Design an enzyme around this catalytic site. Structure first.
Site, short mmCIF file in Angstrom:
data_model
loop_
_atom_site.label_atom_id
_atom_site.label_comp_id
_atom_site.label_asym_id
_atom_site.label_seq_id
_atom_site.Cartn_x
_atom_site.Cartn_y
_atom_site.Cartn_z
N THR A 163 4.04 -2.73 -6.26
CA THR A 163 3.13 -1.76 -6.95
C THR A 163 1.67 -2.21 -6.79
O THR A 163 0.87 -1.41 -6.27
CB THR A 163 3.50 -1.64 -8.48
OG1 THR A 163 4.89 -1.23 -8.65
CG2 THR A 163 2.67 -0.57 -9.04
N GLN A 164 1.37 -3.37 -7.40
CA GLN A 164 0.10 -4.07 -7.53
C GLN A 164 -0.86 -3.27 -8.40
O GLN A 164 -1.06 -2.06 -8.26
CB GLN A 164 -0.57 -4.42 -6.23
CG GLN A 164 -1.96 -5.18 -6.30
CD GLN A 164 -1.80 -6.65 -6.84
OE1 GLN A 164 -0.77 -7.06 -7.34
NE2 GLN A 164 -2.97 -7.41 -6.81
N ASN A 211 0.94 -0.44 -1.58
CA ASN A 211 0.65 -1.77 -2.07
C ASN A 211 -0.82 -1.91 -1.62
O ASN A 211 -1.03 -2.40 -0.55
CB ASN A 211 1.60 -2.82 -1.45
CG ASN A 211 1.20 -4.18 -2.05
OD1 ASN A 211 0.64 -4.98 -1.33
ND2 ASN A 211 1.48 -4.44 -3.33
N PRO A 212 -1.77 -1.57 -2.42
CA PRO A 212 -3.18 -1.51 -2.10
C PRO A 212 -3.77 -2.90 -2.30
O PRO A 212 -3.28 -3.64 -3.12
CB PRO A 212 -3.76 -0.61 -3.20
CG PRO A 212 -2.79 -0.80 -4.33
CD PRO A 212 -1.49 -0.89 -3.63
#
Lengths: 123, 232
Positions: B1-2, B108-109
């Site tokens: 996710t982050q 997932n940035p």
């Protein structure tokens, strides 16, 4: 007995020598001369770069390419193939620098390229 | 996710006639606790470009890693790539952009906002913005995060458009950036007195002035206020 021992390189001739690898030394002899003086302070590389004709451009071509930011690599023999060995250690060093966060030692690098050039004599 | 964990504050900036100023403070807050002090968010890259990063401390460290590899990459082959094909600010920008987009797609940035502050070889100013949505834009005044609506208004009162960049000199710009750190410092509850500052000029190179403090604060008024309204 038999016929060959020079068609493949994962043969071993009976004497205890190789081929092809034994023949590959003559190939490096056709190259130009290139020296290294290991100084107390560092190292100083120098290379004879032939100028065939005045058709070529002077001081615009190189046999000294950098690997990492602190390693000269300077080569003789067959020049595209020598550039492939330089290419290989640019990859290798960047991975090490990612992995362990320090400039890649010279003794580490020496092991790494060594294994690769050995590796092509095993297939 | 982050999602954010440890986060910086803001990097703020504006253009002036002969270069750009950019400044950021030294903070990694881990929410309520202001846990890392003296951990710097401006990263000089090349010799004429300062890339000021806000948001995640984790992620930021790993994008400093890629910048350092990029100087190593551009140097290779060519000896004239440190003289007239150096890493331009538009270059350092392009790679940072493209990395953000591609990381956004896999969901997932890399959670950062960057200003890439420099001057071209042509002498043009470059101040350009990217964030974690992948959005790009240039402006004359630029600021990350909370500072994009706090600090940005004050800065933007000196340079309003693209015809007051010639008329804004290195000394009015110096002042405005000082001022905006202090405006933030009052009304922003994640800030630090220490801040780093870069000044990019087109004739004196990059100067990297570290370890400024904010001074000339107002508090002299606060002995007068008593209670909340019912108490006097």
């Amino acid at each position: 007995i038999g016929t060959g021992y020079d068609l493949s390189n994962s043969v071993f001739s009976p004497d205890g020598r190789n081929f092809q690898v034994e023949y590959a030394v003559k190939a490096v002899e056709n190259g130009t001369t290139s020296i290294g003086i290991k100084c107390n302070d560092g190292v100083v590389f120098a290379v004879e770069k032939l100028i065939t004709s005045k058709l070529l451009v002077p001081q615009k071509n190189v046999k000294i390419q950098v690997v990492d930011r602190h390693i000269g690599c300077v080569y003789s023999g067959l020049i595209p193939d020598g550039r492939h060995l330089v290419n290989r250690g640019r990859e290798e060093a960047a991975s090490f620098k990612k992995l362990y966060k320090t400039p890649i030692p010279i003794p580490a690098f020496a092991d790494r390229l060594g294994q690769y050039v050995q590796a092509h004599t095993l297939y | 996710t982050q999602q954010p964990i440890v986060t910086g504050t803001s990097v703020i900036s504006m253009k002036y006639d002969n270069g750009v100023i950019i400044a950021a403070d030294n903070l990694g807050s881990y929410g309520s606790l202001l846990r890392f002090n003296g951990v710097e968010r401006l990263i000089p890259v090349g010799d004429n470009t300062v890339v000021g990063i806000s948001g995640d401390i984790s992620d930021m460290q790993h994008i400093e890693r890629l910048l350092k590899d990029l100087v190593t990459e551009n140097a290779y082959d060519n000896p004239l790539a440190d003289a007239e094909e150096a890493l331009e600010p538009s270059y350092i920008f392009e790679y940072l952009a493209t990395v953000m987009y591609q990381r956004r797609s896999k969901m997932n940035p890399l959670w950062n906002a960057i200003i890439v502050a420099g001057v071209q070889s042509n002498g043009d100013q470059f101040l350009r913005y990217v964030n974690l949505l992948g959005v790009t834009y240039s402006s004359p005044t630029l600021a990350t995060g909370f500072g994009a609506h706090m600090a940005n208004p004050l800065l933007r009162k000196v340079v309003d458009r693209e015809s007051d960049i010639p008329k804004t000199t290195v000394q009015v710009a110096e002042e405005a950036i000082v001022n905006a750190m202090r405006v933030l410092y009052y009304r922003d509850a994640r800030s630090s007195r220490n801040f780093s500052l870069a000044i990019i000029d087109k004739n004196t190179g990059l100067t990297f002035k570290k370890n400024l403090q904010v001074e000339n604060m107002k508090w002299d008024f606060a002995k007068d206020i008593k209670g909340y309204g019912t108490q006097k």
